[PDB]
Design a protein around this nucleic acid. Structure first.
Ligand SMILES: [Zn+2]
Ligand SMILES: [Zn+2]
Ligand SMILES: [Zn+2]
Lengths: 50, 149, 67, 50, 50, 50, 1095, 10, 47
RNA sequence: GUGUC
């Protein structure tokens, strides 16, 4: 029973799987900024804008 | 400058070109040393300056004399009358140029070591072989005819 | 301090090539060239000479010398 | 214990009356469950489990 | 460092020792290895019967 | 910047494991000193020294 | 793609060549003995007696010499540091002053007058160890790699730790248990430390200072200062709608009390003020130079002070009603303290004491004279100065009540365990807070510190952030003056605050100028001010160590020029681009265009913590944006000295990084170039140190490749039979026999022997011979005919080293033979015999002990992975894979995931590839080498590409199904061997106060049984063993008392009743009887009532 | 005041 | 009997101390001396 | 006071 560095290696088909997620996450998160600046984001909990 | 224990360890690491079949096995305990199961070896060297060397020198190879001690300085002295058994020089270190210690003007070293018979299970210095390994025979079998590239 | 006489893992005598390795590093030879020309082929008995410091040379300048 | 820098201590009972009291109460076979909940504390470690 | 819970409660014991522990999966669950150097120092008094 | 944000959380737990010991041992030695003589009798009744 | 210059890595060595790591410790001292030592002489310049105004002395010039020693009789020869380190002497040089004194009627000017000595640093300017060559460094028996920076006092190396403190001459506004409160601490050069605080309660401001009895209203303080009309008071406070609703109540309660004139307020204050000359003058001089002395008053004008108090009240008002609060965690405000100003305070206090008490030495002689002239150099002394200096350095008690301060634990002995522990201690910083559990903010890593203090470098244990280390690239600013700065600021167009009234400061456009906590005036359009000041600083006229910042929330510009600020160089960029180009660094590579002219050419500049607050810094050159102002040179300089030895720090986790940087100083190895000559108390050395294959650029910067503290060994990451449990590691018996991990211990045994005030003496008889044959006795076996042991011998347990026979008080002599105590069998290396400064013979002996690794020794992986050795396996086991290479140290693959250490496998891979190819691979932080070009290079040879190999098990002889991870790794051996961590005791010595085992192994004591282990025996319910190992084996005593009156008797006899009729005995621990005998003297008699156990 | 170089015989 | 031979640390001259003398060197002004190695026979292990 | 759990 042994462990090497070949055990933990990213797959080529895995690098583009998380690339899509990171791009969609960035595109979705960087919209709420100007959404708040314009005045939006209806709030369910009692809280402040930020 | 070298330690006495480190010097003894490095001297024990030195293998000896000798036939262990003729020698016996030592009994349970005795440190005086008999004639059949103990080999004597002497070593003696002191560092002295070179009177002829040069006016201004930095290289210590010619400035000082006998600054590096090798295994060839060790001399074998007979004990008893077993000198006629091995004719002249079948009892000598395998490698002659092995660094042992370094000396400077005003330094001296004199030692007398005992060589005995032992097995490699006791200490690593009694290993008669350096590398003992084996390998399984490989086999590479192709299945389908390949193309050029 | 001093080059070991034998190797730690296998037990091959590596203490008889230190001065030769030093003298071969000044003939415009690469470290690998000296290491594969001396006779070392495997890597367990190769880092004894490659990765080795020489402190006895600096310790002899402070050693007692006769006047 | 973590088995890297641990230094544990050891005691030796002197009287015969206490040598029998530490065998029935502070016994390794007897003390296998913990009074807190009741789970066995001595089952196995990583290597044996693997 | 008083006399109520410093001396009376403490009462440093004799016939004891402490040493670094090492693994040994060749003993039982209720066994422990003691060095001979410590075993030579420790003594246990007993009365001689028939 | 990512290494700094990662080592910021490592210091969050290293300063927390240093302080727990003090008040934990204090609450332990305060809780033992009040409950150390409560014993069960032979008629299925728990009583104190009185 | 953007033009990138891959050359800026050579700026850092050239910058460290000038100053940096430890050169600042010498800079603080070289500047102190050249600037401040004469400032103190000019401070205390004229002193005269009061008997008759005719006698006086004058201080012309003062200076120190070179390290000299005063021997038997006028013998001043240059001494070397090693001689002082071996003779238990102290490295110091005299201070020769040229003063003049008037005796009789004429004046006498005696040149070169010695007044005392003073210690000198090892690598200072006055020492001999400077500007030398390695060939000459070997002549004086000193390591050239020694960084220095410590003090040698009585043959020990003492270093003063840097201590951080809060900023003075500033206003803080923090919230406490009820609300918010502003405070101000004032401390200038002259000894006046004040702490005033303004608090808010019931909508009423109150000023608290320890000189006043109770609170004084702020409006009363205003009217007393000189501002009479209440309108301009509110004008100075602030003209706003919300600031008046909070300032009205105080105004009306001020109108309530009948105070409308300056005399009324002054009488009110003087009546309030208590002190242990009228009340009006008392209150006037108390408001003048007691409360705020950092704001000087020219004649009697309190205007600057009242505007200061008004802006303080405005800051408190703006803080009131909001959640804007100041914290003490900011490092832009925290200042550092080196050993320079501490020595300055010590020296000035000693000088003032020496001037003031000698003023009284000649004050009792003038009326009670015998002749016409009085000589003062014979009424002079040179022991108090030396005594005070040595005491303050060695003892560590910085107690200056003239300065109202007591500090302990400032100087510490230099760690000489390894080469990293010595350098890493020089960069250690101590905090002002004490080691308590309450702290959580200051211990927490602050976002403020960036590239100044190593985050990973911190000891794990109790202190988890109170001790911090400096970074590679940072500089400590010394103190300056502010003349030209104020002159240029006045010429730029800044306004005088004495002309405009309080209304204009409420204007948003108006900005206030602050210089070291001092209001210079009002400035408009502060952007031009900041730009011009920055341009003048880049020019070269003003010194580069002057900070300037601006804050818009309170609209104030700060100009900081005080000493003790953190400074690191930054590369300047101009609108898209770094000013430094390839042609500018090609000349640096050539040998010209060094750092100082780089600063003179306006290409790089220093920034502080508060100045980088208003600046944008780019990490790399591809992230440079249009608002970035500066460019950080390198990102790997953030790691410290102890964290620079970890391969791939970003790959590893922060707990492992901390563990490794903590264990790096405990790892044993070579000390320096002269380890045979120096004789220290305890020394750990290695036999054959190897060189790290995967080295770091920080290793090359410190030249760690000359003194490594570890060895390279083949590691096989796989489980073995049973002995790689959580942290256990398996060794190779053949490798241990060959000599892998051989250690040496060196112990010191020194003995001094002196004379007495009488003619009594000490003597060393020597060996003892018997009458049967001429042999030395077993007791004195190693002793030479002289009386001491000769080097090159072997000393066993409880044998005499040196015979020491001293008189009881012709005279009878008691022999005190020094006896060697040890479980091992030591060896003698050398013997030194010398004399100290007080004419006593000193004999030193160095004992050597060679040790080998065994089961119970602690090893590390230089990656935060420590473990004790498990089973020692011979060479028939430990399977080879193909060529015949056996695992040197078996590693367990089960500790990897939880610890989450990936840099270990990368380091193993890089080391294997390097030892195969034949070149060292770089593994620096935030860079180094990748795993894409190295694995494809491992294919050319013929091995597998990432990590795998085919192994053949040895105990069975069958191949392994799965593959094993093989490779060379740099391992290191640590301290705390099982040989010393092993103790046992049955019956030894006891204490005289209480019959109980003593503390410590050096006195052969026992173990302690505390309350937490007693709770485990109580929870079980065992009473026999609980009583057996607390009363029977610890202290069993038989006492006797009486039945008539409970009291401690003796010999079955009472002294109270004087009758032995009612007498009985019992068993009690000695501790309880001692407690009874102690309480009976406290008027507390424990009257005891006996009974039969049968009853 | 010192005294060295001695051997005591029993 | 035989004067105790001592070596210096600057000139390494083997001199002798007679009895209660100022501990110094007769060649240089160095105030520290060393000792010679014993002339006995000590056994060592080469294991 | 320092070091380890
Ligand atoms: Zn080898
Ligand atoms: Zn009585
Ligand atoms: Zn000399």
């Amino acid at each position: 029973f042994s462990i090497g560095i070949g055990d933990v290696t990213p797959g080529q088909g895995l690098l583009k799987a998380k690339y899509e997620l990171l791009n969609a996450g960035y595109k979705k998160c960087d919209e709420y900024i100007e959404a708040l600046n314009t005045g939006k984001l209806q709030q369910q909990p009692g809280c402040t804008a930020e | 400058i070298v330690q006495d224990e480190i010097l003894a360890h490095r001297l024990g690491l030195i293998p000896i070109h000798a036939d262990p079949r003729l020698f016996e096995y030592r009994n349970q305990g005795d440190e005086e040393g008999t004639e059949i199961d103990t080999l004597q070896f002497r070593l003696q060297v002191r560092c002295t300056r070179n009177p002829h060397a040069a006016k201004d020198s930095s290289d210590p190879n010619e400035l000082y004399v006998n600054h590096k001690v090798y295994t060839r300085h060790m001399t074998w002295i007979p004990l008893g009358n077993q000198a006629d058994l091995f004719p002249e020089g079948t009892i000598r270190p395998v490698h002659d140029d092995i660094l042992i210690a370094q000396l400077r003007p005003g330094q001296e070293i004199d030692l007398l070591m005992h060589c005995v018979k032992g097995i490699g299970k006791d200490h690593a210095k009694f290993s008669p072989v350096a590398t003992a390994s084996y390998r399984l025979l490989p086999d590479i079998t192709l299945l389908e005819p390949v193309e050029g590239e | 301090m001093i080059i070991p006489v034998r190797c730690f893992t296998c037990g091959k005598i590596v203490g008889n090539k230190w001065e030769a390795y030093l003298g071969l590093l000044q003939a415009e030879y690469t470290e690998g060239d000296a290491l594969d020309a001396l006779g070392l082929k495997r890597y367990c008995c190769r880092r004894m000479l490659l990765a080795h410091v020489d402190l006895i040379e600096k310790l002899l300048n402070y050693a007692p010398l006769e006047k | 214990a973590d088995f890297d820098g641990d230094e544990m201590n050891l005691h030796l009972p002197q009287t015969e009356e206490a040598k029998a009291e530490a065998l029935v109460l502070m016994g390794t076979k007897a003390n296998l469950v913990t009074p807190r909940n009741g789970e066995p504390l001595i089952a196995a470690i990583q290597d044996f489990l693997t | 460092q008083g006399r109520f819970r410093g001396n009376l409660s403490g009462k440093r014991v004799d016939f004891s020792g402490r040493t670094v522990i090492s693994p040994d999966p060749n003993l039982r669950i209720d066994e422990v290895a003691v060095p001979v150097h410590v075993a030579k120092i420790l003594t246990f008094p007993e009365k001689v019967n028939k | 910047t990512e290494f700094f944000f990662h080592t910021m959380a490592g210091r969050e737990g290293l300063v927390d494991t240093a302080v727990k010991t003090a008040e934990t041992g204090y609450m332990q030695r305060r809780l033992v000193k009040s409950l150390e003589d409560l014993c069960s009798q032979y008629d299925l009744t728990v009583r104190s020294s009185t | 793609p953007i033009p990138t210059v891959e050359e800026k890595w050579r700026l850092l060595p050239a910058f460290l060549k000038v100053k940096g790591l430890v050169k600042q410790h010498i800079d603080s001292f070289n500047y102190f003995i050249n600037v401040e030592i004469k400032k103190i002489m000019k401070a205390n310049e004229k002193v005269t007696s009061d008997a008759d105004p005719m006698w006086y002395l004058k201080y012309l010039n003062i200076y120190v010499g070179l390290p000299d020693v005063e021997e038997s009789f006028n013998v001043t020869r240059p001494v070397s540091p090693h001689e002082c380190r071996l003779r238990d002497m102290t490295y110091s040089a005299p201070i020769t002053v040229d003063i003049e004194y008037t005796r009789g009627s004429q004046r006498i000017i005696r040149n070169a007058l010695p007044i005392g000595r003073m210690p000198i640093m090892l690598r200072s300017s006055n020492c001999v160890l400077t500007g030398k060559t390695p060939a000459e460094f070997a002549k004086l028996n000193e390591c050239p790699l020694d960084p220095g920076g410590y003090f040698i006092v009585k043959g020990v190396e003492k270093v003063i730790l840097i201590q951080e403190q809060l900023s003075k001459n500033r206003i803080i506004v923090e919230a406490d248990r009820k609300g918010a409160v502003g405070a101000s601490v004032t401390s200038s050069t002259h000894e006046k430390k004040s702490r005033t605080n303004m608090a808010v309660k019931q909508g009423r401001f109150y000023l608290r200072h320890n000189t006043l009895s109770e609170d004084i209203p702020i409006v009363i303080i205003f009217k007393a200062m000189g501002v009479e009309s209440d309108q301009e008071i509110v004008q100075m406070i602030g003209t706003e709608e919300h600031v008046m609703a909070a300032f009205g109540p105080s105004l009306e309660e001020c109108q309530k009390a009948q105070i409308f004139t300056q005399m009324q307020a002054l009488k009110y204050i003087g009546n309030k003020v208590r002190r242990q000359k009228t009340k009006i003058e008392e209150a006037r001089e108390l408001l003048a130079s007691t409360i705020l002395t950092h704001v000087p008053v020219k004649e009697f004008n309190f205007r600057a002070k009242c505007i200061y108090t008004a802006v303080m009240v405005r800051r408190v008002i703006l803080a009131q009603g909001d959640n804007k609060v100041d914290d003490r965690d900011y490092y832009g405000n925290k200042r550092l303290e080196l050993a320079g100003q501490l020595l300055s305070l010590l020296f000035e206090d000693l000088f003032k004491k020496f001037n003031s008490e000698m003023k009284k030495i000649a004050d009792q002689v003038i009326p009670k004279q015998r002749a016409a002239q009085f000589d003062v150099v014979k009424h002079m002394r040179q022991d108090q100065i030396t005594n005070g200096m040595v005491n303050a350095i060695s003892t560590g008690n910085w107690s200056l009540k003239r300065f109202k301060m007591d500090r302990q634990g400032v100087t510490q002995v230099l760690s000489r365990l390894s080469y990293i522990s010595a350098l890493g201690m020089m960069t250690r910083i101590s905090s002002q807070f004490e080691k308590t559990r309450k702290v959580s903010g200051p211990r927490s890593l602050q976002p403020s510190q960036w590239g100044m203090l190593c985050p990973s470098d911190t000891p794990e244990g109790e202190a988890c952030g109170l001790v911090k280390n400096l970074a590679l690239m940072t500089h400590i600013t010394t103190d300056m003056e502010d003349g030209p700065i104020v002159k240029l600021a006045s010429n730029l167009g800044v306004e005088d605050v004495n002309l405009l009234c309080g209304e204009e400061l409420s204007y948003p456009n108006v900005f206030l100028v602050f210089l070291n906590g001092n209001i210079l005036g009002v400035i408009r359009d502060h952007k031009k001010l900041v730009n011009t000041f920055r341009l003048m600083r880049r020019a070269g006229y003003i010194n580069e160590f002057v900070s300037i910042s601006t804050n818009l929330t309170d609209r104030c510009v700060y100009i900081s020029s005080d000493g003790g600020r953190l400074c690191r160089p930054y590369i300047i960029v101009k609108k898209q681009k770094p000013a430094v180009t390839n042609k500018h660094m090609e000349e640096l590579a050539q040998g010209y265009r060094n750092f100082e002219d780089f600063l003179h050419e306006s290409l790089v500049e220093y920034l502080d913590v508060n100045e980088e607050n208003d600046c944008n810094i780019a990490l790399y050159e591809h992230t440079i944006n249009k608002d970035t102002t500066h460019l950080e040179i390198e990102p790997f300089t953030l790691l410290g000295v102890c964290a620079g030895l970890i391969p791939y720090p970003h790959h590893n986790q922060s707990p492992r990084n901390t563990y490794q940087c903590a264990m790096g100083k405990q790892a044993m190895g070579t000390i320096g170039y002269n380890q045979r000559n120096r004789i220290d108390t305890l020394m750990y050395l290695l036999a054959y140190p190897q060189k790290p294959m995967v080295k770091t650029k920080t290793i090359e910067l410190i030249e760690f490749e000359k003194l490594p503290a570890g060895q390279n060994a083949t590691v096989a990451v796989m489980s073995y039979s049973g002995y790689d449990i959580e942290d256990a590691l398996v060794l190779n018996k053949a490798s241990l026999d060959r000599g892998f991990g051989r250690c040496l211990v060196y112990k010191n045994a020194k003995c001094t022997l002196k004379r007495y005030t009488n003619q009594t003496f000490d003597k060393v008889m020597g060996p003892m011979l018997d009458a049967a044959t001429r042999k030395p006795i077993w007791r004195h076996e190693i002793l030479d005919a002289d009386g001491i042991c000769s080097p090159g011998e072997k000393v066993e347990n409880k044998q005499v080293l040196v015979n020491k026979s001293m008189p009881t008080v012709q005279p009878q002599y008691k022999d005190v033979p020094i006896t060697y105590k040890g479980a091992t069998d030591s060896y003698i290396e050398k013997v030194m015999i010398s004399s100290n400064a007080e004419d006593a013979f000193l004999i030193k002996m160095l004992l050597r002990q060679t040790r080998r690794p065994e089961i119970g020794d602690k090893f590390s992986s230089r990656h935060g992975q420590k473990g004790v050795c498990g089973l020692i396996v011979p060479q028939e086991d430990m399977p080879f894979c193909d060529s015949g290479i056996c695992p040197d140290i078996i590693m367990n693959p089960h500790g990897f995931p939880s610890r989450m250490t990936v840099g270990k496998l990368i380091e193993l891979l890089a080391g294997k590839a390097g030892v195969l190819d034949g070149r060292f691979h770089y593994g620096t932080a935030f860079g180094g080498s990748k795993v894409k070009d190295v694995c494809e290079d491992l294919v050319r040879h013929g091995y597998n590409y990432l990590g795998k190999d085919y192994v053949t098990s040895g105990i069975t002889g069958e191949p392994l199904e799965a593959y094993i991870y093989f490779g060379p790794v740099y391992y290191q051996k640590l301290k705390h061997m099982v040989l010393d961590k092993m103790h046992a005791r049955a019956r030894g010595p006891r204490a005289v106060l209480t019959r109980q085992p003593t503390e410590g192994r050096s006195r052969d004591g026992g173990l302690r049984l505390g309350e937490m282990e007693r709770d485990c025996l109580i929870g079980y319910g065992a009473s026999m063993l609980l009583l057996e190992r607390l009363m029977i084996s610890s202290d069993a005593f038989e006492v006797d008392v009486c039945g008539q009156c409970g009291l401690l008797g003796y010999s079955g006899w009472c002294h109270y009743c004087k009758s032995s009729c009612h007498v009985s005995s019992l068993r009690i621990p000695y501790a309880c009887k001692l407690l009874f005998q102690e309480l009976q003297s406290m008027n507390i008699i424990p009257r005891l009532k006996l009974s039969k156990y049968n009853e | 005041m010192w005294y060295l170089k001695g051997t005591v015989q029993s | 009997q035989q004067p105790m031979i001592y070596i210096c640390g600057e000139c390494h001259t083997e001199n002798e101390i007679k009895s209660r003398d100022p501990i110094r060197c007769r060649e240089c002004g160095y105030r520290i001396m060393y000792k010679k190695r014993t002339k006995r026979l000590v056994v060592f292990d080469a294991r």
